[PDB]
């Protein structure tokens, strides 16, 4: 029994707890989810980027949720077809330059299946270590917050 409801809030929780977002971040993300095809599954293993690109953000952060049981999201390019997603990458990004930089990094994460593989059989600590390392080794994305409280193997 997993759906889209409360996944956005489950991943927003550590941001409001830490104070990286303004008030009900999750609702603003859901509004963008309602109007746009944020899924971009593009693969047998569904990928997603729920996000907001406005203000209501105190600083930039990446929050990665892991879903063991898929929940379909609208596909991009042709929106009528839903596709199941297992891995959800929530992005709280300001100033626009970082949204492109983050998508380019994410493209370098989804591509090369050896990383994408086994992602559903790793603990919160291993996922944190791998994402932290891949961000710190990026040529960009310095200053974006990532921590253990932003990784949920389930939900």
């Amino acid at each position, epitope marked *: 029994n997993v759906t889209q409801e409360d996944i956005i809030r489950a991943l927003a929780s550590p941001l409001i707890k830490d104070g990286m977002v303004d008030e009900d971040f999750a609702e603003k993300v859901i509004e963008n989810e309602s109007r746009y095809p944020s899924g*971009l599954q593009a693969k047998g293993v569904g990928f997603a*980027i729920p996000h907001v690109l406005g203000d209501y953000v105190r600083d930039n952060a990446i929050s990665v949720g892991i879903l063991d049981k898929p929940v379909n999201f609208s596909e*991009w*390019y042709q929106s009528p077809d839903p596709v199941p997603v297992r891995v959800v990458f929530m992005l709280a990004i300001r100033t*626009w330059d970082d*949204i492109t930089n983050v998508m380019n990094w994410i493209k370098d994460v989804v591509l090369d299946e050896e990383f994408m593989k086994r992602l559903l059989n790793m603990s919160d600590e291993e996922i944190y270590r791998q994402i932290y390392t891949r961000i710190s080794k990026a040529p960009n994305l310095s200053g974006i917050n990532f921590s253990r409280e932003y990784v949920r193997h389930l939900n």
Partner: antibody
Amino acid sequence: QVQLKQSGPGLVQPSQSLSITCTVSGFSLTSYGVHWVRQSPGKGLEWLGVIWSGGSTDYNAAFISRLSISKDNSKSQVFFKMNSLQADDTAIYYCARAPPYYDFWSGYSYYYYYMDVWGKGTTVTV
Amino acid sequence: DIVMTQSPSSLAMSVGQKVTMSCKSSQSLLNSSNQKNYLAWYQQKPGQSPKLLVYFASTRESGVPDRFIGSGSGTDFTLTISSVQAEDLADYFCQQHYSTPLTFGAGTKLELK
């Protein structure tokens, strides 16, 4: 209810610059893009360099061999204005809206580079 | 720049039958699936409508119902919606998508007689 209205001079000889202002109402300049295209009776249509109107971000110059000097593409919160010093050709006048979102699998830029709703245009002569 | 060309210069039209047109370019296909193109409809006076076709699917707006989508390969094409009434407009201009210069091609137009 949602319109792009264009106004500017015509009968402009090479000694005077061309300046065209497109007033945008119903298509906020913090979300939607605005593109410009030239349509002469004798050559086909051509793309002019644009600034995305969802925020004055990353001016994409087009046709460097056709690029004018000091082409500012100034964007305000009320209207967008184009200028060109030479005004040595005709029919430079369509203003159009571009989709307000990201081209996730683009190979060069994350904007769609697609025109949706066109304005009425102007008449430009030399 | 990237070459853009149309096959017909103009087509005769009557109420009945279908009207066929095609468009070629250096390349419109993407490696991460999908294809990006668009064919524009121009009323002789305002000339305001590339909006009737987005990529290879009916547009976001009402557009015209049952618009036909042609080949999804290197060469693109389209047919009118079987027999149409329309009027003698430049119903299609083929444009490049997925390209910084966004070069435009010539129109086709319909001709009653």
